[PDB]
TrEMBL record, chains A, B:
Gene3D superfamilies: 3.40.47.10. The active site is at Q163. GO terms for molecular function: 3-oxoacyl-[acyl-carrier-protein] synthase activity. Involved in the type II fatty acid elongation cycle. Catalyzes the elongation of a wide range of acyl-ACP by the addition of two carbons from malonyl-ACP to an acyl acceptor. Can efficiently catalyze the conversion of palmitoleoyl-ACP (cis-hexadec-9-enoyl-ACP) to cis-vaccenoyl-ACP (cis-octadec-11-enoyl-ACP), an essential step in the thermal regulation of fatty acid composition. GO terms for biological process: fatty acid biosynthetic process. PROSITE patterns: KS3_1 (PS00606), KS3_2 (PS52004). The gene is fabF. One of its GO terms (cellular component) is cytosol. This is 3-oxoacyl-[acyl-carrier-protein] synthase 2. Transmembrane segments: none annotated. Pathway: Lipid metabolism; fatty acid biosynthesis. It holds the Pfam family ketoacyl-synt. It comes from Pseudomonas aeruginosa. Its EC number is 2.3.1.179.
């Protein structure tokens, strides 16, 4: 029968820091991680800024021999995973290695490496493709390399559900533990899509903010002057652990994962329905999964991408699920500060939701100068709001109409 | 407890055929779908052959306009999925659409689209990248597009576990149903990596057979003259359905899905351990999941890729798990005929495992002219073997040491 799941360790790379505490300090101070991109020339592009990871030292985590063969998204995923496992205090042994698995996902994976090898192929021929091209680029190799480095022999897989990846990865890893398939899972996501194909492709879809002259103001969820999402890089990883297994080893427990919901919009390849019907179905699934009255929800980490249709669909979904209580909870988009980490969005946002619980503070939605029509909830405009938070919900919505909701609560 | 899961519908594109019965007819006749790749200059490449889908007509499924937006791997996944749903007879309604979901995966995703958009970007700059590049290339768009087309509102996700994708997708979809998160799932995988990037990428790792003179003899699992796997394209989709749901509407049931096993080798990025210890844990996990003794297994659809180390690891793993029964079961690699469909391998091989049960016949391992050292199991060399099959296993063992096993049983 279904076991309880707690969070015992967290790890992160974000545009705000090279770990969780540094990222969280940035979140609570309303700091932007968005800046013009330096790692390539973007003068031909309609968007030239993003949330880059600043000063990432892979030689804190991996031999340079290994690092040189792995896409940045794998390096970022391993870094966050290593942080999370160290943070957990968990020791891997012959007695437990079969019971510890990994589910680290990505939306796109090793686009930079694939682009770079495509350029080699076209200009120079196939003999110039890297021998490490496949294992260094495909999405499942965060899970793969983490298992090899730590000796994890439990379920080993990867999700790819676009902007919902991190939320799905964490939810389905919790189900693995709940149902007895594992006692521990390392789960989350990683993304580094900031190459010509990534910025060019989202640019071709007119999905990105073009606020090149004021990048820190570009990401403005629910603001009347929003003009698309900001592309950001990084990773989130959590150690999920069965409750009794955590208790038995004296683990520090951050929070309990009580609820997971999924749904499909079955509406449009890229656009959310205006009424947020699929998002509402997904949150209701999650609240019923957690055995909660919707009034128990104190804080929502919104998807809040700063798109015209996405931001308003989320207000419509929260109002439909929570009714009058929609005016009592706090909802914020930390994408106002971090931008959109795509496959890693749900992973860093789950961590922010757990830290909202630990610290009893709703993070701000920065740049919310002029809330749009009907965006009249507590969106924690501009400044962090200390408040009672027993239950936190993290939402993600993705291309394909794919929705995920995670429900966390304080653990006593 | 747990609900029972049955197979009510199947769909396929393979190198042997454009549907299940044509593909299966090729399998039982020992036909090869391997040939030199056409409409492509592979002069500078060390491998110039593989398993192409021949004569695929996407306009049987999609309008020309909707097909132009989607990578070939997505088109192939949608063709298999539509076939599977049609085969099942299922009627989607407002009363059941929240209980019907999708988990169709891919190993490598939209390399063809990535190539063609790289060409545009490198030659003409980012403003010539297709607007549909991102939503038409990402792995979760088979699940996305299928959900939108059929109005499926159930769990909507995509796995990417390299060569294990199709096996994991089907197994985790079976869990969704068993644990009451869905009544119906469409599950499996699709792949189209016979672009330069796939032939070039696997070729740079020297993972491919280079038997260009005789492509049909290239894929020769357990034969002493094997020299790596053969790259192939296509898709497999199953309709998985809760047993009472299937009985209530009078569904034709092909077989029961009784077991799902996962493990991680935690050994190496691309090569299995010599003794196949991970593959052995995974098969034991699958049989435990099914409450079956190894003695009850009649038929194994091997991973059987035609790599020197992979093939010998699987023999060791089967001898370890099955002991005095390892010679009584029959084990074959249909990759001897189809080549290696990577993420779709596990999907088409689950369908071949179900059909082995329906028709009481072990498909052949063609090209097994000279079994290697210690490859003395019943490998069904050369020709199909009619026999008793109550229980059939399908194994997938991929990059990152990620393992999956499905256990199917006759239903009556
Ligand atoms: C199994 C037989 C009846 C068959 N032949 C061809 C096709 Cl394409 C299909 C299908 N499921 O769409 N089914
Ligand atoms: C499985 C059933 C519904 C089906 N689907 C597709 C085809 Cl092609 C046929 C047929 N050949 O009459 N029958
Ligand atoms: C990229 C190469 C050097 C590499 N890096 C890390 C690992 Cl863990 C392995 C492996 N054991 O398969 N190989």
């Amino acid at each position: 029968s279904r076991r309880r799941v707690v969070i015992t360790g967290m790890g992160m790379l974000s545009p705000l820091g090279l770990d969780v505490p540094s990222s969280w300090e940035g979140i609570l101070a309303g700091r932007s991680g968005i800046a013009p991109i330096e790692h390539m020339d973007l003068s031909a592009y309609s968007t030239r800024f993003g949330g880059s990871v600043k000063g990432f030292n892979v030689e804190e985590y991996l031999s340079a021999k290994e690092a040189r063969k792995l896409d940045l998204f794998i390096q970022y995923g391993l870094a966050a995973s290593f942080q999370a496992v160290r943070d957990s205090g968990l020791e891997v042994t012959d007695a437990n290695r079969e019971r510890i698995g990994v589910s680290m996902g990505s939306g796109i994976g090793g686009l930079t490496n694939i682009e770079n090898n495509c350029r080699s192929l076209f200009e120079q021929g196939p003999r110039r493709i890297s021998p490490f091209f496949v294992p260094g680029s495909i999405i499942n190799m965060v899970s793969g390399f983490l298992s090899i480095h730590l000796g994890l022999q439990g379920p080993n897989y990867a999700l790819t559900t676009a902007q919902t990846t991190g939320t799905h990865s964490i939810g389905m890893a919790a189900r693995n533990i709940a149902y007895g398939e594992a006692d521990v899972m390392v789960a989350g996501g990683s993304e580094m899509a900031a190459c010509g194909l990534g910025l060019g492709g989202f640019g071709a879809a007119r999905a990105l903010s073009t606020r090149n002259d004021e990048p820190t103001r570009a990401s403005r969820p629910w603001d009347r002057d929003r003009d698309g999402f900001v592309l950001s890089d990084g990773s989130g990883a959590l150690v999920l652990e069965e409750l009794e297994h955590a208790r038995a080893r004296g683990a520090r427990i951050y929070a309990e994962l009580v609820g997971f919901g999924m749904s499909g919009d079955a509406f449009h390849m890229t656009a959310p329905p205006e009424d947020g019907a699929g998002a509402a179905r997904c949150m209701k699934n999650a609240l019923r999964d957690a055995g909660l009255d919707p009034r128990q929800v104190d804080y929502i980490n919104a998807h809040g991408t700063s798109t015209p249709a996405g931001d308003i669909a989320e207000i419509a979904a929260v109002k439909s699920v929570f009714g009058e209580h929609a005016h009592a909870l706090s909802m914020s988009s930390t994408k106002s500060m971090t931008g959109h980490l795509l496959g890693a969005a749900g992973a860093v946002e789950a961590i922010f939701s757990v830290l909202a619980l630990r610290d009893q503070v709703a993070p701000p939605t920065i740049n919310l100068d002029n809330p749009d029509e009907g965006c009249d909830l507590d969106l924690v405009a501009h400044e962090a709001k200390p408040r009672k938070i027993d239950v936190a919900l993290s939402n993600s919505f993705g291309f394909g109409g794919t929705n995920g909701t995670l429900v966390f609560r304080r653990f006593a």
